[PDB]
């Protein structure tokens, strides 16, 4: 049995639609558990400065009660069958999913149709969630990576809705009335924006027939005519430096404008990112790692950690690198990161592309282990691609990358481009923006 023949035997994702436009998608297995959820085309990029934070607030209030399950009846019902009710919001998506036994799918879908459609949004629970969201803001400030990536978004997408954080500034959380939160759900929690995904021991026909008795009153109509529309987000080469020498380590995120989701350049770029890879000081192979930046950082103790990232949105993205290091090593970290970028742009070699493609295949297959990653894969894929891209198609797209492809795409996105830079902490030795900008081309080239 060959990896190629295992990809073909990976089961199919059935997709069926309701009249309201709700899209129902499921990957069946023989597992005795399942993960069913609702993925909505919602996030803070659809929020303006007035209501920024409303989606995170609605997520906060989602499980706190509905018109039929008063406030903790929902929690007792989910708990008494051993299920797990999670939620998450990003700048572009919002998910509500349950991990249940396969026999509990009818109750799991009935729980989500109630939650996504009939949140009481009670005036008394909004005040209680204010203090939590305010406290969670302070808990968030303590995470330097979250701060530095919010900073990267704020400077990269300045002037646009994508600069906003999901949570919103701690000025709107105290002002979001019930009417705001009611309006956010009335504008964004619609069937044509919603995907009902399942994965595990779930038959598609039965999930369909549950959706068309629980979600079938989820309209896609907008008050009078006021349907919200898409707004593209300008990228800005820019810098945001938050200098705080009391913090023991510096966090540096640097990104160029990357492709949106449906751009095939994503596959060659992810490959190339696998060439730079990622490092942590607790790794192992260390100085013998194939990634040049990893081996230099391990040999010289240049950093505590570094990662490559490709964050995608509908029409743009952030393609770059985040590293944590001490105040006297930022310069070397930036030098070697930009040198590796330039070396991929100009002189990627076939063997490192083979290893990078190997890494990408392994990351894609290992990621999809379990019902919950598959359920999120289905929901997010229908929101971003309008379909589920099979692992066979991912393999076919990876098989087409070579060193020439990597050189051309890394040239297009990295070479002689202006990056957004976020620095937090003891960042006095983080290079000046002209010096970082000069690191995006080579004079030898």
């Amino acid at each position: 049995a060959t990896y190629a023949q295992a990809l073909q035997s990976v089961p199919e994702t059935q997709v069926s639609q309701l009249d309201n436009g709700l899209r129902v998608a499921s990957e069946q297995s023989s597992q005795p558990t399942c993960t069913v959820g609702v993925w909505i085309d919602a996030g803070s990029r659809y929020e303006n400065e007035k209501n920024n934070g409303a989606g995170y607030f609605v997520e906060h209030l989602a499980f706190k009660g509905t018109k039929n399950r008063p406030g903790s009846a929902l929690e007792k019902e989910v708990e008494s069958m051993g299920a797990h009710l999670n939620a998450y919001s990003t700048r572009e998506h919002t998910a509500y999913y349950i991990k249940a036994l396969s026999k509990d799918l009818p109750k799991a879908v009935e729980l989500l149709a109630d939650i996504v459609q009939n949140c009481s949004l009670e005036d008394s629970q909004i005040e209680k969630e204010r203090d939590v969201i305010l406290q969670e803001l302070q808990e968030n400030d303590s995470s330097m990576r979250d701060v530095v990536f919010d900073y990267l978004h704020a400077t990269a997408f300045q002037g646009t809705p994508l600069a906003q954080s999901v949570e919103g500034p701690s000025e709107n959380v105290r002002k979001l009335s019930r009417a705001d939160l009611t309006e956010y759900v009335s504008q964004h929690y619609k069937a044509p924006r919603m995907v009902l995904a399942a994965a595990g021991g779930v038959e598609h026909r039965q999930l369909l027939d549950l959706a068309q008795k629980h979600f079938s009153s989820l309209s896609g109509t907008y008050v009078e005519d006021a349907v919200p529309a898409f707004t593209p987000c300008r990228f800005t080469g820019s810098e945001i430096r938050h200098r705080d020498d009391a913090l023991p380590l510096a966090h540096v995120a640097i990104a160029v404008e990357g492709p949106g989701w449906a751009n095939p350049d994503n596959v060659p770029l992810q490959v190339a990112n696998a060439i730079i890879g990622h490092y942590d000081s607790t790794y192992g192979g260390g100085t013998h790692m194939s990634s040049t930046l990893a081996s230099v950082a391990a040999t010289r103790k240049l950093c505590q950690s570094f990662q490559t990232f490709n964050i995608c949105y509908a029409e743009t993205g952030l393609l770059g690198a985040h590293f944590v290091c001490d105040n006297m090593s930022i310069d070397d970290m930036m030098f070697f990161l930009q040198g590796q970028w330039m070396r991929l742009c100009t002189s990627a070699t076939e063997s490192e592309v083979v290893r990078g493609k190997n890494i990408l295949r392994n990351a894609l297959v290992s990621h999809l282990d379990g019902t919950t990653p598959v359920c999120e894969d289905i929901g997010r894929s229908l929101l971003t691609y309008g379909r589920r891209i099979p692992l066979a198609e991912w393999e076919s797209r990876i098989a087409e990358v070579d060193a020439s492809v990597v050189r051309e795409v890394c040239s297009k996105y990295f070479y002689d481009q202006c990056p957004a830079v976020a620095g937090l902490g003891p960042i006095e030795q983080l290079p000046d923006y002209n010096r970082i900008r000069s690191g995006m081309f080579w004079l030898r080239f």
Binding site: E239, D432, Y433, N434
Partner: protein
Amino acid sequence: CTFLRWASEPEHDHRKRMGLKMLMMMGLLLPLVYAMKRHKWSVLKSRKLAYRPP
């Protein structure tokens, strides 16, 4: 007196032709190098500072 000015300065005409060429080259180079300096320096000249003490 014309001949004596030439005898004192046989480079008079060539010096003035070189001066014209220098003036045109400077009237190109000084604005463009000034633009170069301001391109590099715009990062400093437009940056904004915010103080957020605890």
